[model samples]
Target: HMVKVGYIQMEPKILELDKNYSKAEKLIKEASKEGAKLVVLPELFDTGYNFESREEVFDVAQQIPEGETTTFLMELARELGLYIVAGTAEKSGNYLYNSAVVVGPRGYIGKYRKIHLFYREKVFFEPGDLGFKVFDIGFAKVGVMIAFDWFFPESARTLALKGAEIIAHPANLVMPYAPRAMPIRALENRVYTITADRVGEERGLKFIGKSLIASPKAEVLSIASETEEEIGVVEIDLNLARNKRLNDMNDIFKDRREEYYFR
Candidate 1:
């Protein structure tokens, strides 16, 4: 299990792939220098969130597995020898989907086609058909979920059931800093939930960038700014998370009484 992880929070410019990719690359190297094995980028990081309406930027949706963005990230991972959880607009067979691609040490492990589409994403993109699955990187059972996915309890639950040790979520919150829910998502299942939010305003939207790294014990290990661009690194012992399952029934998930909580 990896003991070190880095979460980057940047102010991505609208539709700037080259600049965004370079910034991401720089952060990855910096994190690796800080001794992090896993690094996460923000939601729709390659292209800033809501960069354009479907009419304007539809063609910008890059093809997965063989696109410029994917290639760049794959090369970055190989060069840095670190796993990445990142968001991108996926274009496949006339369909555009808000997707999160996971790349690991050997190569591109797999991807999570967002199951729950953000409200407007349905207007411009198709929801992913594949059921969610956790990607097992040697570090830990890693999960990737995009911005809106974090809204549903089942989203995290499904990944956890699929054996996710930590779920890295890329979020673009344009308003409403719902910090309270971070704890619920963490403590609810005793799982680590890290979200990287975009920081800045564009197209009349105000992004609240409280990018975060949370723990099952309801600890906010690291939280970036709501107004400034920030990046952070955290090293967690997967053994501790493993122990949360064995040490006591207090392990948030094992103690669940579904009958009482679910309707």
Candidate 2:
């Protein structure tokens, strides 16, 4: 089966939840009009990155599903008859988490928290307790990972092993390596990847915005501008990701030599 996916790359102002929500809604509607079935937004798209303190982070964070951001996305998804991978700041009790929530036409699906916290994030968020997980969104089995998790190969690999055909990545990337590394992850795992990255500077920290959709064959289907707010949509055949054969005799999964690697 074939599906069209889209990524929204935008600059979010710190603590400006209303403005960010409006911007995201506009972009999501545009992507939907373009016939995209799945649309992804950048990490913390509702709240900007670079919080000065935990108290400040808490001020902007909200509980999942019940949160305004998630509920807003859910309503949009239901109205558009599409799926949305919303990246937001999650407040659970006394702790905060960098999380991505998946909502579809039916309603709330599931969520994935950031396992690999980067730099100053350690001071503001808790390490993810829920491990890698994949959800069936009708069109495909999709998984999620936040910004810094791109460095760890296990993040994507674990999802692939759990039967993820597509990985929806929500990133606030500052370092340059992630955009370059994602294709290799797709090539190695034979899974499609959509990385939605944010642009512009926040508190003196600049986020690189080369958001892209990569095919299972490591081909870059579509990529957005580094310094602009844009939406990129690409059509893909899920069968390409379903097939793990490198050639006639070698199957990527069947040929795995997990015994030699550390568990």
Candidate 3:
């Protein structure tokens, strides 16, 4: 079956919960109106990037499935009859995590904690302990990865090996590298990749908002702007990713020379 994937690139005001929630709701509605079957949002989309301390972050973070943000997304998924992927801060015991949640029309699905915490994140969030996982959403199998996770090719490779046909990448891009690297990840995995990034500045941090969706062949299906808030939607066939074929002679997975490169 053909599926329409939509991603939103928004300018979220730091620590402004009400404003952020409204914007996300608006974008999701717009994406649905445009016929997106699965919609994605940016990392920590409702929360601002720069937090002065852990105390401030924990004040805002909440337990995964029990969190208000997750509850909102779950309801929204049911309302629109579509699937959603959104990022937020997760609280467990005294530890906080940078995590994303997957929700479908049925209800809450699962969550992915960020395994590789970036620079200052090490100061705030704990390393993800859940490991990588893939979810079967009826239409496609999806794997979730956070911002800096894209730097490590192993993150995408791990998901690809686990039968993930689509990799949903929610990002807060400050370093300006992932846009260029996304294609390589898609090409090697032979899977569709949707990278949703945020825009605007927080404290001294400025995010480069170039959200994109790339095909299995490393082709850009849709991309957003560096300075604007937009919704990007693309029609794609999950079957395109189901096939590992490159040509008559080469198979993307079967032809891998991992045995030789292992050393």
Mark the regions of model 3 whose C-alpha exceeds 4 Å error after superposition.
none
Best by TM-score: 2
Candidate 2 has an lDDT of 0.92
Q: Considering lDDT, where higher is better, how would the candidates rank from best to worst?
A: 2, 3, 1
Tens-digit lDDT track of model 3 for 143-215: 9999999999999999999999999999999987898999999999999999999998889899999999999
lDDT per residue (tens digit) for residues 199-246 in model 2: 998889999999999988889989888899999998999998999998
Alpha-carbon runs more than 4 Å astray in model 1: 244-251, 257-263
lDDT of 1 by residue, 1-263 (tens): 54888788887887888999988887778888988788888888888776457855467778888888888889999988889888888888788888888887678878778888866778877888877778878769887788877788898888876778788888887646445677677766667777888788878888888888888777899988888766778888676555557355456566767899668
Cα-based lDDT for every prediction: 0.79, 0.92, 0.91
Model 3 poorest 10 in a row by lDDT: 11-20
Give the Å error, residue 243, model 1: 3.4
Clashes per prediction?
A: 0, 0, 0
Against the hidden true structure, what lDDT does model 3 obtain? Answer: 0.91
